[PDB]
UniProtKB/Swiss-Prot annotation, chain A:
Residues 97-101 are annotated as: Aspartate-rich domain. It holds the Pfam family TRI5. The keyword Transport does not apply. It comes from Fusarium sporotrichioides. It catalyses: (2E,6E)-farnesyl diphosphate = trichodiene + diphosphate. This is Trichodiene synthase. CDD domains: Terpene_cyclase_cis_trans_C1 (cd00686). Changing C187F: Increases the KM for farnesyl diphosphate by about 1.3-fold and reduces the kcat by about 2000-fold. Changing Y292F: Does not affect the catalytic activity.
């Protein structure tokens, strides 16, 4: 693991975007986390959900807490109900995100069943499409369409990843093709605009623009931040950075530099474009960018604490800047699970 | 002002050389037979009373649209069956025709998902016709390729929605142009529709197919953009093409925008050849026939007006000009067919009957 370069790149990003999280007071944070967790926990504990969603209890629990954090930390302006419903949707996607399964058999009659209104054969689709209305009720038709497309894309992306194919050497378009596919970019981007707070028709151009630009910023930031948890992980391996290596036949070092440059430029344009636009829009965008980073630095899923410990000592400016940022984020989002994530889904299921 | 004829010619010849544009075993008689078969089934389809009443399109525009699409399909999907060419011609005609609607989708999309999940007919009449006909297209493909057609068509619908706003992007919104082009490009629909299950094993060639979709998406939309650059140059009605959006969103000159497209198009062409040259022969054949047929369609369909360029430089002693004309003659030689030879009777005649 290029620890030395991981610190280099991460520091460049955090410093360039001027990472800082003022999204909530600690009381507000805990309050939202618990609300979202509580509703989702009861949802996933239902027998039907327990029966069709094939996932290890411990894994479901960890996935739910990771997503509640992501939603609460990054969608700081939407209502508690919206955070909760979104948390359920993104927990379904995270579960699929780490899974190993062959969709082929259950996708043979996908369209015909869809058109006829018959329950989907793939259990994931059966649960996701049944729950979807609870998510879409928060948005106008345009944003809703984006959520639907992006989730369908994501499903295809996880399907492709099952083949552990990083692209044919020379297939330069493959890496980003897959990343957009599995990125859930338009879903995340469009889910930032609840109709309760934003009028889809009045802000059509800014929202469309935000979806287009946020898609890349969002995915790339995760490619960089999650570069650590991914790397020695089997389910991953097939990633933008590693596919850049195989497909464009370049060095991991160059791949990371490529990713970092794109990310910095994406950040740059986010500012240029939205700085002088509707204040409410800029506010939501800012809350997302900052909270999104706080989430990557704190959440267990990305285990960046491991890199903190190993680097906490050595003083190389680059290593010190990382720990500073890591500490700053921890001071805001390092909330203990016992303060909000209870009771466990399992306990509610066996009730 | 003034169309960059030189640069255009150079890029075009380069494009055709990179893709190895050359004669094939696909004859004029075969084309005519396929053209008429696809046109005949599609014409009868669109002439049905239900189609006639729900699809709001001027009859002459529909006639012209169907003819251009049938040509595009018959020429580019050279390896698929007559039925497949016919069914894809209907689908791509539905997509082309949606660009004629200026009606805000908002009202008909408010209950999109609930109706979809419940199996109730969609409120937007276009979805009603398209989703009803889709099985005829999908029956030709496996589940993976099918999913791709479904997604791409859904994206296309959103793409048409966004375009009603005549928005080329905010200055500084560098990621907007390609975001929109991919939305309205039908890249994955095209890419995945090149592999009927009757001719290819989706699972066995998953890697080849997935890679083709990824690479063909960009090659196809960019070649359409490049070849359409001439007809769109002074079209004051067409305001939001990829190139014009590059100008607005990236704040660069039309020339630079054109350069960007050229570089992407040429590079894409090279990598297509490089990647698939050594793979399965049938796969490479389908891919090569698409590229050549797609180019032949652009050179032969008058909507692109490329004849005006050929006519303007057919007597120059320049290398590029000469190479262009030879390619053009190659194209016309096998692709220049009179509509009277296959596109009959008109859809309207079949409709009033
Ligand atoms: Mg993933
Ligand atoms: Mg993942
Ligand atoms: Mg990742």
């Amino acid at each position: 693991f290029p620890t030395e370069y991981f610190l280099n790149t991460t520091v460049r990003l955090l410093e360039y975007i001027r990472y800082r999280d003022s999204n909530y007071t600690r009381e507000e944070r805990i309050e939202n986390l618990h609300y979202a967790y509580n509703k989702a926990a009861h949802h996933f504990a239902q027998p039907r959900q327990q029966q069709l969603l094939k996932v290890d209890p411990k894994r479901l629990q960890a996935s739910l807490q990771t997503i509640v954090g992501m939603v609460v930390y990054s969608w700081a302006k939407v209502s508690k109900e919206c955070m909760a419903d979104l948390s359920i949707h993104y927990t379904y996607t995270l579960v699929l995100d780490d899974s190993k399964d062959d969709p082929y058999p259950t996708m043979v009659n996908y369209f015909d069943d869809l058109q006829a209104g018959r329950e989907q054969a793939h259990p994931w689709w059966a649960l996701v499409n049944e729950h979807f209305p609870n998510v879409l009720r928060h948005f106008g038709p345009f944003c809703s369409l984006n959520l639907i497309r992006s989730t369908l894309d994501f499903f295809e992306g996880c399907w492709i990843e099952q083949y552990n194919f990083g692209g044919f050497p020379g297939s330069h378009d493959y890496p980003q093709f897959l990343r957009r596919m599995n990125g859930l970019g338009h879903c995340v981007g469009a889910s930032l605009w609840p109709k309760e707070q934003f009028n889809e028709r009045s802000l059509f151009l800014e929202i469309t623009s935000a979806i287009a630009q946020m898609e890349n910023w969002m995915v790339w930031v995760n490619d960089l931040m999650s570069f650590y948890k991914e790397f020695d992980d089997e389910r991953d391996q097939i990633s933008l950075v590693k596919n850049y290596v195989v497909s464009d036949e370049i060095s991991l070092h160059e791949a990371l530099e490529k990713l970092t440059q794109d990310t910095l430029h994406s950040s740059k344009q986010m500012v240029a474009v939205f700085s002088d636009k509707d204040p409410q829009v800029m506010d939501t965008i800012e809350c997302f960018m900052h909270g999104y980073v706080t989430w990557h630095l704190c959440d267990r899923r990305f285990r960046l604490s491991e890199i903190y410990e190993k680097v906490k000592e050595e003083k190389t400016e680059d290593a010190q800047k990382f720990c500073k940022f890591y500490e700053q984020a921890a001071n805001v989002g390092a909330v203990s699970p016992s303060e909000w994530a209870y009771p466990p889904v399992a306990q509610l299921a066996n009730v």
